[PDB]
Amino acid sequence: PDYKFWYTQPVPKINDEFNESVNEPFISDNKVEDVRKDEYKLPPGYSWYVCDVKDEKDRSEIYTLLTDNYVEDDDNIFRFNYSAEFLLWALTSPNYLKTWHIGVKYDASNKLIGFISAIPTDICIHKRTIKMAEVNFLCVHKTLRSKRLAPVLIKEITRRINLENIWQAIYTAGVYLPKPVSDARYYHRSINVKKLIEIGFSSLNSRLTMSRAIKLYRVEDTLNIKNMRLMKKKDVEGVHKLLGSYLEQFNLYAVFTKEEIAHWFLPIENVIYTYVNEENGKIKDMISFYSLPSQILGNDKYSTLNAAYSFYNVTTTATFKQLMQDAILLAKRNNFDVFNALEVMQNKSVFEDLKFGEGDESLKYYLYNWKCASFAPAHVGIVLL
Ligand SMILES: C#CCCCCCCCCCCCC(=O)SCCNC(=O)CCNC(=O)[C@H](O)C(C)(C)COP(=O)(O)OP(=O)(O)OC[C@H]1O[C@@H](n2cnc3c(N)ncnc32)[C@H](O)[C@@H]1OP(=O)(O)O
Ligand SMILES: Cc1nn(C)c(C)c1NS(=O)(=O)c1c(Cl)cc(-c2ccnc(N3CCNCC3)c2)cc1Cl
Ligand SMILES: [Cl-]
């Protein structure tokens, strides 16, 4: 590929590799005063729109755009179906900016046909903490693909982020772009076996009959960590200490304030599930996973695959395998069909014994305007939504 757009940007070329001692911007000494004050030009008939995600109607417009036009698997069987409540949660973290929730409307219909978003986060990369933007939910309507709208959305959000004196970003994508700092495969743990077979997500053979498959993935309805319970407001301080200490071992992680811990972990039904083990008023273990269904395209019986995604999990009183076994159980108790995880942090070590199957795609982690050594995904300590 030529990367005609990306090679104009402060990112590594596809052949670039850096020593572990290199950890710095491509372009330093940036000046807010020099940032373009004009919005990037859109093709005739299209206009920028600042979305208010706290307004139900604006939020529903984003929801519809993404439901119909967002990420599909390579075989066009599944399309992500982020809920409206999920989008509210994902986009209104502490110190979010409404003007970083950017839509594009088709003037004649007044309909939203494009979107991109950013939220601010402090990112520790190779022990250096940098104020960054986390870019997500880039989407162009299926009818307008391959018209070079995505670089316009990227350049416009870059401009708006730069106006706030932020010059680095973090982002993930399934597509290969210049140039990942890490690459993490997805793994899947079947919960509702029969449904997964019926929709083609899983397979049988003459050895693995339907009944044998169901027995293989059967789980005992008893927690290894008996007191694991839904997180409450009183647990924010203890989760902040437990998770904050845990994440410092990694090469890439978010540095969460107490306010960010409250936002990202306090439970919201059908959005975010966090469980804690409290001993003597101290949080000693935590499990968390978020809800992200996929629409099943075309299937007669089922419209929705109900998937839980591993978020952040820490144990100090059990083994990591016991903890993730409880995570699977808690997902099953909340009626999820499958439990998905990336090979980040310590996750890969438990996939075999807990009967995860390797998927067929990976998530690439990227930094914008930052050069550093790449690393194996066990050194990644951040999960983006
Ligand atoms: C400081 C501060 C800096 C802030 C900025 C940091 C950089 C942020 C980059 C964006 C990160 C996005 C993270 C994600 O949210 S992930 C989910 C992506 N959402 C989907 O997968 C939904 C379904 N899909 C679509 O909605 C469209 O396919 C897209 C993704 C909008 C792409 O639009 P289309 O019509 O194909 O392509 P056009 O408009 O002709 O643009 C082509 C150029 O674009 C590049 N590109 C494509 N996908 C990308 C992508 N996902 N992220 C970034 N760049 C992408 C591509 O390579 C090429 O450029 P070159 O010529 O190769 O240099
Ligand atoms: C079962 C299923 N349902 N769907 C809808 C799909 C795609 C699958 N197959 S999958 O599990 O193997 C999978 C998964 Cl989960 C995710 C991605 C992917 C692609 C691009 N971008 C992201 N980002 C997520 C983080 N924020 C930025 C966007 C994820 C690709 C694959 Cl292929
Ligand atoms: Cl129990």
Side-chain angles (χ1 to χ4, degrees), residues 3 7 11-18 176-180:
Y3 299 120
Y7 276 4
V11 297
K13 312 302 176 190
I14 222 67
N15 290 331
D16 281 353
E17 295 177 16
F18 305 102
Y176 184 77
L177 307 167
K179 182 179 182 166

Side-chain angles (χ1 to χ4, degrees), residues 12 51 107 114 118 129 158 175 288 315:
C51 301
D107 298 339
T129 302
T158 299
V175 289
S288 57
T315 186

Side-chain angles (χ1 to χ4, degrees), residues 228-232 234-240 242-257 259-279 281-349:
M228 196 58 81
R229 59 158 175 83
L230 278 170
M231 189 188 173
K232 298 171 159 176
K234 66 173 183 176
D235 305 320
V236 166
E237 184 185 13
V239 170
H240 180 236
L242 178 70
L243 182 64
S245 303
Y246 170 80
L247 290 176
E248 294 183 343
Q249 70 184 283
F250 298 111
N251 284 351
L252 178 68
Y253 62 97
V255 189
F256 294 124
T257 64
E259 292 80 13
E260 286 173 308
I261 292 292
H263 181 84
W264 290 121
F265 293 97
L266 283 173
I268 304 170
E269 186 167 78
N270 299 319
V271 174
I272 173 66
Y273 296 74
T274 302
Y275 295 85
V276 297
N277 180 46
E278 187 179 26
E279 300 190 356
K282 302 181 182 305
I283 301 305
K284 296 210 178 175
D285 310 272
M286 68 180 287
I287 289 167
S288 57
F289 48 87
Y290 56 92
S291 176
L292 174 49
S294 288
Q295 180 179 355
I296 309 163
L297 306 177
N299 189 275
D300 288 358
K301 186 173 174 183
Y302 300 102
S303 72
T304 306
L305 171 67
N306 300 307
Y309 286 78
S310 182
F311 198 36
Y312 295 93
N313 303 287
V314 187
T315 186
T316 67
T317 69
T319 67
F320 194 69
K321 184 162 97 178
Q322 282 175 320
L323 184 79
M324 296 302 294
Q325 184 167 44
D326 283 359
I328 293 161
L329 175 58
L330 292 162
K332 180 183 180 79
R333 285 181 172 179
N334 283 284
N335 301 122
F336 289 98
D337 301 317
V338 66
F339 183 92
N340 299 320
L342 293 162
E343 56 174 340
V344 298
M345 293 179 283
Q346 316 166 68
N347 288 351
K348 179 80 158 68
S349 65

Side-chain angles (χ1 to χ4, degrees), residues 1-9 148:
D2 292 325
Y3 299 120
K4 293 296 198 175
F5 166 66
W6 272 109
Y7 276 4
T8 68
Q9 302 297 292
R148 313 301 290 186

